[PDB]
Design a binder for this molecule. Structure first.
Ligand code: CLA
Ligand code: CLA
Ligand code: CLA
Ligand code: CLA
Ligand code: CLA
Ligand code: CLA
Ligand code: CLA
Ligand code: CLA
Ligand SMILES: CC1=C(/C=C/C(C)=C/C=C/C(C)=C/C=C/C=C(C)/C=C/C=C(C)/C=C/C2=C(C)CCCC2(C)C)C(C)(C)CCC1
Ligand SMILES: CC1=C(/C=C/C(C)=C/C=C/C(C)=C/C=C/C=C(C)/C=C/C=C(C)/C=C/C2=C(C)CCCC2(C)C)C(C)(C)CCC1
Ligand SMILES: CC1=C(/C=C/C(C)=C/C=C/C(C)=C/C=C/C=C(C)/C=C/C=C(C)/C=C/C2=C(C)CCCC2(C)C)C(C)(C)CCC1
Lengths: 340, 339, 329
């Protein structure tokens, strides 16, 4: 936390998650409980989407949110964009459900059996003890999360190359994509038309390039400690790293909301509905060209608008926490109105 | 119980059943009274169901639940899934009533004639007294229960192999199977596809295998105590062992609800109804494929959905007793919202 | 201790004369119901119709023995019912005579007598004289079993419902291994000759039990596994009579051999709604039932209520007077 003086600070219940921000074990426990909640939502809602799926209609009109996310990977897709056999969606939903179960079990284990601070441990638990002031352990955690995201990108790459086939909007069948792009100059040139790429080989080439970039960043962050040039320009607290991550996930949400509404192959038009139109009224939303009867919207509209609004409010959360990390009081803005 | 204040911690009447967690003389009376109520349900409710039975309609139509539980054992079913008499269901319910009567008598004995403690005797009861600190005696009680469960499994195998025939979904006849399964390779292969078996012989062979496995586990728990790493990893208390068993019975209830949902040979489709579909709305219910006239359900749904709910709430009871055994009092939650 | 007037018969626990008097008076009331209601519910009888439809309650038991019935199962007389009712009248007379003589004239404490009364006083802490009373009662019940055995040899034998004849039984079973295997074949033997053949074995068993109880007292373990108080001995007797009432309700439900089906009623059906009961296969419209359903249901409910009375006296005997007060703090 910030703690502009008053080192022994007490937070009330409406800021109740600020109480464990200094301790270590509850800091692990709350986050793995949150990951259990995300895995539970994923598995339980693709099961709920299998429960409320009709094969006599098109996909995106009935609010199909997760089954197009699995059909773009090409798991149970047939011919012409038709889904007749849904075994592996139920398989990955059950996998995510039991994964949420074991993650919640570990969360309650760290809340109950593991102590608050990991400095009282003796074996490997003392090596996992972290503080918001030393950047070395934070760099180790940073590099290992970099390595895990790179491993996830490599798993997606193997799903595109060896472990299965992806889906395209041209042939509307599965496709075993091999021999991707190997040139980084055209990847440097992809900063202008990244929204419409229209080729899956370029997609898996960009994915293996960003995956190898992530592995390089991971081994770089594990190998060298963080330097001194960034410690003079970046703040080192809980709310500072919270702010950097909040701005990162808000930018990622804006990027994903732009990617959802205009793409055609990473979001097929028969699975998510037609591509959208960026329409600014009061706020910039995404409207469909055709109008659904029961005031309804496609999955593309729901995904793009929800991710845009969540990215917007996460940007203001980054703003709140980043101004908090710079020393602002925030009753100073109430004292500025009260002095007036 | 965690013994917060001391061993004589107070309890109100909404938790008064925690008062005999350390007495170990009222434990016996409460448990065999629950066994008496279980046998009372098992007998009196099939006596209730034998009065409202219709021979023309299907058994999964009006809500017959216990009679399809006995019809798959081949007691009073004719050819093609039709019931020809009501006598063996009546005598099985009657002997369950007699077992309930003698177990309730033993319960009133153990709460009335037997003392509140069991270490206060001088005969065989001194060797029967248990408490929640020693691993070897509790392992002995566990091994005795494993021997009893394996004996029940071998009794089921003897019923299927020597005490008449059995119903199947292949020939639709009361069939006496023979030559059960020896190799565990198909038993290992059934671990990844346990929904459909397509063999009654492999079912009774797996039953003989798990029965012998339970006799072996009971003998192992009788002879040798826990080696020492269980005292380091696990816990040994009332609430901890209760939570272990609650998680076990919740997992058993989950897999039993799923086995009632998908399978169609252990539960015959002409007796319970058509095989259900796992429809997750606000909760996962195992819904029918046909529709009943006035808000009714088939008996397979009444089995599977109720056992799913009971497995869910027993999972949360396992969570409650696990947190109770791990030093959490649930009084820091009400104390973390003040000031 | 003191008992209120709403429940004050517990004073018979120490007074022995009233203990004899009230029970012999109760037996006089039973014999008065046996004699008087046979001679009073005879005007409801009509041999033109059936015996199961009118609701005759006593006379089925008299036609069970095979006194005034012949071929086809028809009643042509009343005079055997008259002589059995009349001996029940004079038996109730002499039994009530001894009853009120013990109530009014005999002393209460039998140990304060001089002749053959001081050797007749009983109490609740001895296994010897109570064993003598048990032996004499076992002798008399075995004598009643001997009378049932002699009914199949003296007056033409019992009545058979299968062959529709009052046949003389003269084939006793000389093997107790059939008696062992009867626990599956309860009320389904399809033979009337095997009932008397099972009655002579249990009759000689009753004589042997009475001889064992007269000759030797409880030799030591009955002082430990059992109690001798009045409430506990009442509990044991009520449990025995409740088991008897339940098995008699089962015999009135399922047998249709000892009870003739053309006289008592059709075979019954075991049902359960709120309480378990028995219902006829052929119902009657005027809110009436056969003697089978009436007897089986009433004996089932009375056996249940006397099982509850057995549990009440067992809780009263073993110190559980009022201990559920400590539920609420
Ligand atoms: C995703 C939801 C989530 C998760 C995982 C947690 C997790 C946690 N909360 Mg929490 N909390 C939440 C939502 C959540 N909270 C919400 C919505 C509120 C507002 C009602 C609170 C209010 C709150 C308070 C007031 C406190 C916690 C505390 C705790 C910690 C428990 C420590 C203990 O056993 O005592 C644990 C890390 C406690 C804590 O960290 O104290 C050390 C504590 O005092 N929480
Ligand atoms: C999303 C992933 C991620 C994150 C959060 C960071 C975060 C950071 N990197 Mg970094 N990095 C990454 C990926 C990432 N990197 C990748 C993929 C590479 C390519 C191999 C690098 C290569 C790199 C170098 C070469 C350096 C950093 C440095 C830094 C730190 C200073 C801030 C900075 O330079 O601007 C962001 C900061 C902690 C600098 C450092 O160590 O200073 C502390 C530094 O010199 N990074
Ligand atoms: C990375 C995510 C993240 C994390 C870890 C935190 C963490 C924290 N924030 Mg926070 N915040 C975030 C994102 C995040 N914030 C965003 C995106 C916003 C913008 C809206 C804010 C705005 C914000 C404010 C304004 C304040 C905090 C405060 C705090 C601190 C106290 C704990 C707390 O939140 O109270 C516990 C949380 C609650 C009691 C929840 C409040 C109940 C809300 C109103 C209901 C949820 C709204 C809605 C229904 C959500 C669903 C949306 C849609 C599906 C309908 C804690 C360190 C407080 C602080 O620094 O004081 C010490 C504080 O005053 N945050
Ligand atoms: C399955 C049902 C069941 C069974 C077998 C028992 C059995 C028992 N309960 Mg009990 N109880 C139950 C349900 C049950 N309870 C319910 C539902 C409640 C809540 C209303 C209680 C509330 C309760 C209290 C408050 C007490 C008992 C006590 C007892 C013990 C009796 C000792 C005595 O006579 O004094 C006995 C083991 C007593 C005990 O163990 O301590 C003497 C006691 O004080 N019970
Ligand atoms: C094998 C199962 C088992 C056993 C032996 C116990 C044993 C115990 N539990 Mg328990 N529990 C269980 C399962 C079990 N629980 C499950 C599955 C849950 C989740 C719901 C709980 C939740 C729970 C709580 C929240 C608490 C206990 C407590 C206790 C202890 C005190 C006795 C008691 O319950 O109060 C005496 C019993 C009663 C008062 C009976 C109440 C019955 C209510 C009125 C039923 C309401 C109807 C309900 C909807 C169910 C309907 C079923 C439907 C089919 C009709 C005792 C050691 C308490 C404790 O730790 O001590 C303080 C406590 O606070 N338990
Ligand atoms: C109408 C029938 C009748 C009659 C006339 C009598 C008459 C008598 N009984 Mg008697 N008795 C009867 C029925 C009858 N009892 C019945 C039905 C029972 C219950 C089985 C008893 C149980 C009984 C006992 C237990 C005793 C008598 C005793 C006596 C005698 C009183 C004292 C005496 O003379 O001996 C001096 C007296 C002759 C007492 C006696 O001494 O005679 C054995 C005695 O102790 N009676
Ligand atoms: C309904 C009639 C009846 C009644 C009330 C009793 C009652 C009794 N018998 Mg018994 N008995 C009976 C019929 C009966 N018997 C018959 C028909 C036989 C077969 C001959 C026996 C053979 C028998 C033996 C061999 C013994 C008893 C004993 C006993 C006493 C202890 C209870 C017991 O057996 O636990 C055990 C008890 C007073 C025991 C006794 O008096 O000594 C403890 C004993 O040893 N009985
Ligand atoms: C052979 C059978 C037998 C015997 C000898 C006894 C003997 C005794 N019982 Mg008893 N009891 C029995 C069977 C028996 N009971 C059965 C089967 C039940 C269950 C229904 C009970 C329930 C019972 C209770 C609940 C109590 C006794 C008590 C007593 C003792 C006090 C004296 C007495 O009877 O009060 C005489 C009492 C009355 C005559 C009742 C008053 C009048 C009522 C209101 C009328 C009867 C109600 C009934 C509905 C009428 C219609 C009859 C119906 C068949 C049509 C005495 C030792 C009491 C005790 O322990 O001592 C204080 C006591 O509290 N008994
Ligand atoms: C708040 C809080 C917290 C947190 C926690 C959490 C948040 C949790 C979560 C957790 C979770 C979230 C969990 C999960 C679980 C899971 C489960 C419970 C599952 C189950 C399921 C099932 C069993 C299923 C089944 C099936 C299958 C498998 C298939 C077929 C069909 C069916 C569907 C039936 C803490 C403690 C830290 C602190 C305090 C407060
Ligand atoms: C090709 C392609 C692709 C790929 C992509 C990629 C590969 C990307 C990358 C990306 C990246 C690679 C990005 C980056 C960016 C960055 C940023 C966004 C940053 C920001 C930040 C800032 C600006 C900060 C600053 C600072 C510092 C550094 C320190 C001092 C102070 C300050 C704070 C100021 C895809 C798949 C789509 C498809 C196909 C095509
Ligand atoms: C053949 C026949 C017959 C006959 C019958 C008889 C012969 C019967 C018998 C019966 C019997 C012969 C029975 C038995 C039973 C038994 C019981 C029922 C017992 C009980 C007991 C008790 C309850 C006791 C116990 C105890 C002891 C010992 C001690 C400890 C504790 C106690 C108390 C628990 C008739 C006529 C039908 C006809 C036809 C044929």
């Amino acid at each position: 936390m910030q703690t502009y003086g008053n080192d022994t600070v007490q937070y009330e219940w409406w800021a109740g998650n600020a109480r464990f921000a200094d301790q270590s074990g509850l800091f692990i426990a709350a986050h793995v409980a949150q990951a259990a909640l995300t895995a539970f939502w994923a598995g339980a809602f693709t099961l709920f989407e299998i429960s409320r799926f009709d094969p006599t209609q098109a996909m995106g009109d009935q609010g199909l949110i997760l089954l197009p996310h699995l059909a773009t990977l090409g798991w149970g897709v047939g011919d012409g964009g038709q889904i007749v056999d849904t075994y592996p969606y139920f398989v990955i939903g059950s996998i995510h459900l039991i994964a949420s179960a074991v993650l919640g079990a570990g969360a309650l284990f760290h809340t109950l059996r593991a102590p608050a601070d990991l400095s009282t441990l003796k074996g490997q638990g003392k090596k996992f003890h972290f503080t918001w002031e030393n950047p070395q352990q934070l760099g180790i955690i940073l590099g290992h999360h970099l390595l895990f995201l790179g491993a996830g990108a490599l798993l997606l790459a193997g799903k595109a190359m060896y472990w299965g086939g992806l889906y395209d909007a041209t042939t509307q069948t599965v496709r075993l994509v091999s021999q991707p792009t190997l040139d980084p100059l055209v990847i440097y040139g992809y900063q202008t038309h990244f929204a419409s790429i229209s080729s899956l080989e370029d997609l898996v080439g960009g994915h293996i390039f960003v995956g190898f970039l992530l592995i390089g960043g991971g081994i770089w962050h594990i190998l060298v400690p963080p330097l001194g040039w960034a410690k003079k320009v970046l703040l080192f607290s809980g709310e500072a790293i919270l702010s950097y991550s909040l701005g990162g996930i808000a930018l990622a949400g804006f990027v994903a909301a732009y990617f959802c509404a205009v793409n055609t192959l990473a979001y097929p038009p028969e699975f998510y509905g037609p591509p959208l139109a960026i329409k600014l009224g009061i706020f910039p939303y995404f409207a469909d060209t055709v109008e659904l009867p029961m005031h309804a919207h496609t999955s593309r509209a729901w995904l793009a608008n929800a991710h845009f609004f969540l990215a917007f409010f996460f940007l203001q959360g980054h703003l709140w926490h980043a101004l908090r990390a710079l020393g602002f009081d925030f009753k100073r803005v109430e004292q500025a109105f009260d002095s007036l």
